[PDB]
Design a protein around this ligand. Structure first.
Ligand SMILES: COc1cc2c(OC[C@@H]3CCC(=O)N3)nccc2cc1C(N)=O
Length: 299
């Protein structure tokens, strides 16, 4: 139960060069974006920070956007951990709602897997630490009775040491009876990562495990979760191709690595495969996932 800094909108507007939407690669301040806002690089109190300015980028109301702003703050006040991005403050005065975070110099796992802007590919050694760190962050959330509901590589940020930091808690849901699955009338999340039961309205921590399985496939292959000009379009379908012996995990391993070994790659794939079980009750819990990922690098 934390209390955060309250920033003025105009200081955040000033330190981000009037919310310069041009990418940093061309002299702007934009680091990235989501369906609910744009992230800008800022400089407050000599400290580099990230400023997420909330906007209706997809079909969403002002009231729903304010609820996600409040929910992010509420979750960040309760959940502080090594593998969760740190909220420094917020801005609720003036024109837009802003959320200020600790600066993540290596951006998102999605951007690093795609080598966006010419960044060097992540080694298998770094990818293993990222998978372990992301699982430790999800474990902390589930231990504190929170369901993220939007686990994906755009929501796994990378700090100055490539430590994984789960981000975007605007859709997170608390549950005193952590088990006991409930339903919602507003289905939210990212389609390419969503569990079948989440697509139907169910709210359960088992859906976070399924989404994490898609993230593990992106880590192994370097492929995005969805690509409309690829066969298969959805990355999750490669699990079925491998099960039906049409292909092997070796046919899909990211070629942009030089230090992957068959044993640890097959160990990570086995975890991803278990996470992606269509029946939610057959998936492992996050504790089991954490254990399997630790055994993957043990020697
Ligand atoms: C929340 O803080 C950041 C979000 C970044 C980002 O986000 C893409 C989506 C939208 C919001 C989200 O959480 N994921 N892409 C690239 C770089 C980012 C850096 C930070 C940062 N803290 O430096």
């Amino acid at each position: 139960d934390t209390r955060f800094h309250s920033f003025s909108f105009y200081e955040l507007k000033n330190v981000t060069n009037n919310f310069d939407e041009r990418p940093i690669s061309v002299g702007g301040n934009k680091m990235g974006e989501g369906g609910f806002g744009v992230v800008y690089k800022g400089y407050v109190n000599n400290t580099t920070v990230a400023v997420k300015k909330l906007a209706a980028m997809v079909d969403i109301t002002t009231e729903e956007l304010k609820q996600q702003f409040d929910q992010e703050i509420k979750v960040m006040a309760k959940c502080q951990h090594e593998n969760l991005v740190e909220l420094l403050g917020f801005s609720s005065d003036g024109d837009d709602l802003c959320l200020v975070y600790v600066y993540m110099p290596n951006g998102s796992l999605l951007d690093r897997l795609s080598c966006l802007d010419g960044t060097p590919p992540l080694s298998w050694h770094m990818r293993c630490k990222i998978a372990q760190g992301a699982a430790n962050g999800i474990n902390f959330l589930h231990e504190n009775h929170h369901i993220h509901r939007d686990i994906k590589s755009a929501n796994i940020l990378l700090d100055e040491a490539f430590t994984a930091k789960i981000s975007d808690f605007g859709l997170a849901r608390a549950s005193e009876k952590f088990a006991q699955t409930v339903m919602t009338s507003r289905i939210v999340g990212t389609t390419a990562y969503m569990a079948p039961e989440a697509l139907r309205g169910e709210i359960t921590p088992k859906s976070d495990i399924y989404s994490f399985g898609v993230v593990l496939l992106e880590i192994i292959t370097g492929l995005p979760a969805v690509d409309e000009h690829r066969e298969p379009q959805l990355l999750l379908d490669i699990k079925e191709e491998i099960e039906d012996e049409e292909k092997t995990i070796e046919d899909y391993i990211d070629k942009k690595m030089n230090d992957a070994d068959s044993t640890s790659v097959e160990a990570m794939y086995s975890v991803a495969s278990q996470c992606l079980h269509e029946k939610k009750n057959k998936r492992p819990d996050i504790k089991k996932v954490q254990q399997l990922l630790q055994e993957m690098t043990a020697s």
